[PDB]
Amino acid sequence: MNDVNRIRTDIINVAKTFGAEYSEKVLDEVFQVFGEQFADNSFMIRTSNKQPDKLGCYFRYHEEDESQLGLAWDIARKSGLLSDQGRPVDQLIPEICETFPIMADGVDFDVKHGLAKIWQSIKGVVPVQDAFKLSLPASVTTHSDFLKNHHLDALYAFGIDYHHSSVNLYFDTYHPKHHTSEYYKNLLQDLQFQPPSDELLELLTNNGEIALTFNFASPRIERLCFYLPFLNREAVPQNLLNPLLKKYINEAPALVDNPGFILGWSFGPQGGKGTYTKVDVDYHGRTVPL
Ligand SMILES: CC(C)=CCC/C(C)=C/CSP(=O)(O)OP(=O)(O)O
Numbered sequence: 001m002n003d004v005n006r007i008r009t010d011i012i013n014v015a016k017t018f019g020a021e022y023s024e025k026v027l028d029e030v031f032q033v034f035g036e037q038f039a040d041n042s043f044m045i046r047t048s049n050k051q052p053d054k055l056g057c058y059f060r061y062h063e064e065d066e067s068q069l070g071l072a073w074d075i076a077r078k079s080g081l082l083s084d085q086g087r088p089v090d091q092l093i094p095e096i097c098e099t100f101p102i103m104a105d106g107v108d109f110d111v112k113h114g115l116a117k118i119w120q121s122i123k124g125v126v127p128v129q130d131a132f133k134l135s136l137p138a139s140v141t142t143h144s145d146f147l148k149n150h151h152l153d154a155l156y157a158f159g160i161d162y163h164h165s166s167v168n169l170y171f172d173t174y175h176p177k178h179h180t181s182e183y184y185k186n187l188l189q190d191l192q193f194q195p196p197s198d199e200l201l202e203l204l205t206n207n208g209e210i211a212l213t214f215n216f217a218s219p220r221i222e223r224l225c226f227y228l229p230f231l232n233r234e235a236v237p238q239n240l241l242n243p244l245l246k247k248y249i250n251e252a253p254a255l256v257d258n259p260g261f262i263l264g265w266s267f268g269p270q271g272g273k274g275t276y277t278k279v280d281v282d283y284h285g286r287t288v289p290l
Contacts, residue, residue: 004035007283010253011045011059015111017251018047018244020057022111030109033079037061037072042106042287044262047248049276055244058116060108060280062287070097072105073118081115082162088135088216089165095134096120096158113163121157125172128155136167137214143221150187151175152210159211166215166222173208181205184226191221193267194275200240200265203228213274223274225266229288232258240265245279252281260288 008031015022031038042062047055063072073093076082084090096102101123108117128147131140147153152171159168177183181201188195196204209227230236236249240263249261260282268274282288 001036001039003039004031006255007031007038007043007059008035010283011057011111013253014045014047014248015057018057018248019054020047020111021054022057023113026114027111029079029081030114033075033081034061034107034109037063037075037107041065043283044280044287045252045254045283046278046280047245047252048264048266048278049242049245050274053244055248057111058108059111060106060117062104062106062119064104069102069105072107076107076115076118082118087162087165088137089160089162089167091135092158092160092167093118093120099130099134100126108159110163116163117159117161117168119157119159122155125154125156125174128153128169128171131155131158131169137216137218139214139219139221140167140169142219146190150183150190151177152212161213164215165217166213168225169212169214171210171212173210178207178210179205187224188267191224191267192270193224194270194272196265196267197240199237203237220269223266223268225264225278227262227264230261230263231288232260234258236261236263241277241279245277248279248281252279254281254283254285256282256285259283259285262288 038061046058103123104121106119110116154172154174156172157170184204211225213222215222233249238246262280264278266274266276
């Protein structure tokens with residue numbers, strides 16, 4: 001369709017507009033193999049802040065259709081976009097699929113580097129201890145007391161990062177403290193991560209999504225992320241966005257006049273690497289309303 005070539009053009013436009021490194025060759029190979037799954041599924045375009053003056057650009061899709069579940073991994077492997085290094089990360093997706101009933105999956109793409117991440121969403125929420133049999137990083141188990149103590153133990157999804165050999169764990173915000181700003185202040189303090197502004201803390205009371213990143217090199221929790229949805233460009237708190245990301249919320253491409261957004265705040269060791277902002281445009285306009 002034209003829908004697919006529209007999507008490839010919008011992304012090169014973003015990558016160029018916002019100074020994001022990219023590889024036309026790489027984009028081609030991804031779209032050759034995955035283009036239709038973009039036009040036919042929940043689809044989002046991301047820019048992040050990991051480097052002060054230039055955004056990176058990503059694009060991702062979410063497969064909710066029962067019959068298609070598992071084809072993302074198959075497609076990824078058969079075409080060579082995801083090849084096996086025997087890495088500690090490389091066995092996780094098969095293990096997850098045998099252990100847990102799966103209700104959604106998705107692929108994340110880096111406009112320069114190609115296929116970056118694969119998500120698995122469990123059917124329903126599970127005690128995180130049920131994931132302890134998997135070849136996750138040792139740092140997951142060794143923080144089991146910390147996961148329970150901060151009510152980060154209702155596990156619903158895995159994100160497997162192949163560029164960084166790291167794993168994201170996703171947590172439902174079941175506990176009354178998750179609607180409290182003091183919980184996010186105390187969580188960032190306990191992790192010795194960079195403190196949040198009061199504006200962000202206020203927003204986090206109606207937070208609903210928490211993610212934790214673990215990797216095989218480090219005995220420490222590498223970073224965490226909070227996610228909030230916003231219905232449209234206007235609903236976005238723009239005092240939390242630097243100028244480059246302000247421009248992105250006004251000019252991010254989508255097939256609706258006023259797309260919704262998912263914003264992500266990554267936090268890591270204070271004075272260290274991983275405290276930045278993520279902006280996801282709801283390209284089709286049907287991810288955010290759900
Ligand atoms: C990705 C799609 C289509 C919908 C979900 C929006 C969402 C929660 C994205 C999170 S991907 P994330 O784990 O935040 O990626 P990292 O930067 O942590 O590697």
